[PDB]
From a paper:
As an important member, 4-hydroxyphenylpyruvate dioxygenase (HPPD) catalyzes the complex transformation of 4-hydroxyphenylpyruvate acid (HPPA) to homogentisic acid (HGA), a key step in the tyrosine catabolic pathway that is common to all the aerobic organisms. In plants, HGA is a key intermediate in the biosynthesis of tocopherols and plastoquinones, which are essential compounds for the photosynthesis. Inhibition of the enzyme results in foliage bleaching of plants and eventually death, and thus HPPD inhibitors have been developed as herbicides for many years. Each monomeric unit consists of nine α-helices and sixteen β-strands that form two barrel-shaped structural domains: a conserved C-terminal domain containing the active site and a diversified N-terminal loop domain.
Inhibitory kinetic analysis towards the recombinant AtHPPD indicated that Y13161 is a competitive inhibitor (Ki = 24.16 ± 1.01 nM) with respect to HPPA with the characteristic of slow binding (and). Similar to all the known inhibitors, two carbonyl groups on Y13161 formed clear chelation interaction between its two carbonyl groups with the metal ion and a pronounced π-π stacking interaction between quinazoline-2,4-dione moiety and two aromatic residues (Phe381 and Phe424) (, and). Additionally, the cyclohexane moiety interacts with the surrounding hydrophobic residues like Phe419, Pro280, Val269, and Val228. Intriguingly, the benzene ring at the N-1 position of the quinazoline-2,4-dione ring formed π-π stacking interaction with Phe392, which results in the more complementary in shape to HPPD active site. It should be pointed out that the interaction with Phe392 has never been observed before in other HPPD inhibitor complexes. Most importantly, the conformation of the active site of AtHPPD-Y13161 overlaps very well with that of the holo-AtHPPD, but remarkably different from that of AtHPPD-HPPA complex, suggesting that the binding of Y13161 indeed keep HPPD in inactive state as expected. As a consequence, the H-bond network of Ser267-Asn282-Gln307-Gln293 would not form due to the far distance (~5.0 Å) between Gln293 and Gln307. On the contrary, the H-bond network of Glu394-Gln379-Asn423 appears around the Y13161, just like its presence in the active site of holo-AtHPPD structure. Collectively, these observations confirmed solidly that targeting the conformational change of Gln293 is an effective way to design new HPPD inhibitors. Overall, due to its excellent herbicidal activity, crop safety, and toxicological properties, Y13161 (the approved common name is Benquitrione) has progressed into industry development and will get registration as a selective herbicide for the weed control in sorghum field from the Institute for the Control of Agrochemicals, Ministry of Agriculture (ICAMA) of China.
Numbering used by the authors:
A (entry chain A), B (entry chain A): 35 to 194, 201 to 250, 262 to 287, 291 to 403, 411 to 432
The structure:
């Protein structure tokens, strides 16, 4: 059931901001490995003396990579005179975040109708403020509140390309890479305790709720297009607890990137795993794919089923739809954040968000496949 | 003239160690953009709880990329019990280095006959010690002394693959990339004052000395295969001063990578500039290549000359030989460290090091070409 209890009008995921130590190298690695286009920048060449920010896009997916310059470049600046394009940025916060967690997501940004209203309502319902609403170039309003750990939920609202202060990248430097990724499906956080974390986030958004490892629940917006699952560990080793130990606390676990064609996406990504791209988790045993026809035989032809076997793609099914999924290795040095590629089948109305679930059935289907 | 005044037996450049925030993403970017093979690792999967280190190799060129884990992973370790494979590593030093300078070279490593003797003699002749000699697995000895800024000169000596504690990468994860790079030619540092810096480094090594921008001199070993130029700025804007401001002091400016075939190297690197690799500085004006036949007409055929024009390759000449060179854009966010590709022609005896010089003539040949 959908109570539709959003306390402000939420639309879609807008962007994901990574806080790194060197934004150039991460952006280039991600661009090549994921097939994302280099489309906007904010740095020294655009007059930003505070931070380097490079935007990658694939369809509607927007990845932002930000790193701090030497504070000496902007020592005489104050906040009213800053040359930073993202006003919530903070040298001390960024360096502390990066040295504490390593590479990871700082901001999950969602587009809203009015960021300042979204901030006010959120704080009045228990959200811890992080950056107050600020209007950029009389065009865009941005505000941030705490989500979990050091991750903040960012509200963006437009009066009427990314943000003021960003430059469109020249076509010569912008290679039209595309492996089929089109938008962000969901963003999942790991916390030490799911109870307080759900109560906190559901408390200020009004989002409703959608033997190995974790306990989890999924918070969703009204149209169920903004999906925010959260994991806690179970003790008795949990992948969630390993994340908390290596990340130094709560944070974002994985980003799910919907592909228009997961087969092409995975062929392009796997071709590049060993030449600068991303490695994937080991494939399921062949017993797993020898049981797929037993479950998804009416959805996937056995030509397509065996194509999932070469690519290592997982299949799960739901009340209303079918899910195709695969997980990469951790994106950086630490066994923390990783990426999942998905494509959903069913629930045609547009496609309703969350069609197929999130792969809970794949835990027992893989536990039993390895026998 | 060559005084051959080395105070200990120096052989060759051994490796360059980059200190980064995330060693996975930098290594992968460098691997793809430069065509270097992923050949050794030291991290969690090999029992290293202190730091992640990934070695790239192309011919004899060895690039090492190191980042610190969370100190919590090794809080109970002391130096005699450390699981770090590089014992000179220090969480506080690495994070301070990276947050102060951004991505850059921490260690220029040269192979010597006896690292502990090299350290003792160096310190007794005025070198500031950084890490005392330590014997690894009764096989390799490592020691470090300060070079300039936070860059240390590292001595490696072998009793008889990189270091103890590193694992050979499995062939499945090791793609044989190769764009023609074969060894490190020279490593150049920028300092605020060339006088004290030369006196300091020449003082403890015994190395002998080999209107726009800089003042520089080149220190060399006996066989002149280890070459260490140093730049200072001239005021009246200097690229050297810009480096010092953005790097927060002295450091390594550029690494010169000798290619067996600079034409193929540059074609492979340029093909990849916009898909995760490295950008190059803008090419000289066509007037420059319209004057190349006037100077190098006896060395390069005009088919090869015009091939330098498409690639943007610079040509300089010496008393004894000819130099081919090109410079990349800065490797990271800050306008600091960059890379130069070179191939030397002449001085056949093996080829004697430094054949062709370092491109001093290209300053006036480019100043006059732009007219
Ligand atoms: C990738 C990996 C590495 C080491 C250990 C493990 C358990 C895993 N791992 C997963 O992380 C994983 C995650 C999801 C997933 O996306 C998901 C959750 O199940 C929680 C609810 C929200 C959500 O979206 C589904 C299936 C998974 N499976 C099957 C899996 O094996
Ligand atoms: C690449 C770039 C960017 C912005 C500003 C400038 C001056 C440059 N720049 C160089 O840095 C450069 C460096 C060398 C060089 O390698 C070298 C030196 O001349 C000092 C002695 C040791 C040594 O090896 C040669 C030619 C150069 N030229 C011609 C050039 O234009
Ligand atoms: Co998921
Ligand atoms: Co040089």
């Amino acid at each position: 059931k959908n109570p539709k209890s959003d306390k402000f009008k939420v639309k879609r995921f807008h962007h994901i901001e990574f806080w790194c130590g060197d934004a150039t190298n991460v952006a280039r690695r991600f661009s090549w490995g994921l097939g994302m286009r280099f489309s906007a920048k904010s740095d020294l060449s655009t007059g930003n003396m505070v931070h380097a920010s490079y935007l990658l896009t694939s369809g509607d997916l927007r990845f932002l990579f930000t790193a701090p310059y030497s504070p000496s470049l902007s020592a005489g600046e104050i906040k009213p005179t800053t040359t930073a394009s993202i006003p919530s940025f903070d040298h001390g916060s960024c360096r502390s975040f990066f040295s504490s967690h390593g590479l990871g997501v700082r901001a999950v940004a969602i587009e809203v109708e009015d960021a300042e209203s979204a901030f006010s309502i959120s704080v009045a319902n228990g959200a811890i403020p992080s950056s107050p609403p600020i209007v950029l170039n009389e065009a865009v309003t941005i505000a941030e509140v705490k989500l979990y750990g050091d991750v903040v939920l960012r509200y963006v609202s437009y009066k009427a390309e990314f943000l003021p202060g960003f430059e469109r990248v020249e076509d010569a430097s912008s290679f039209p890479l595309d492996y089929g990724i089109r938008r962000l499906d969901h963003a999942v956080g790991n916390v030490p305790e799911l109870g307080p974390a759900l109560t906190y986030v559901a408390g200020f958004t009004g989002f409703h709720q959608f033997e190995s490892g974790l306990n989890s629940a999924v918070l969703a917006s009204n149209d169920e297009m903004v999906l925010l699952p959260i994991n806690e560990p179970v003790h008795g080793k949990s992948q969630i607890q390993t994340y908390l130990e290596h990340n130094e606390g709560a944070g974002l676990q994985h980003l799910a990137l919907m592909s228009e064609d997961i087969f092409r996406t995975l062929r392009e990504m796997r071709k590049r795993s060993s030449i600068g791209g991303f490695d994937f988790m080991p494939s399921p045993p062949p017993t797993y794919y020898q049981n797929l026809k037993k479950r998804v035989g009416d959805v996937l032809s056995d030509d397509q089923i065996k194509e999932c076997e070469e690519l290592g793609i997982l299949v799960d099914r739901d009340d209303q739809g079918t899910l195709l999924q695969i997980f990469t290795k951790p994106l950086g040095d630490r066994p923390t954040i990783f990426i999942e590629i998905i494509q959903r089948v069913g629930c045609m109305m547009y496609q309703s968000g969350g069609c197929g679930g999130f792969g809970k059935g794949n835990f027992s289907e893989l536990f039993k496949s390895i026998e």
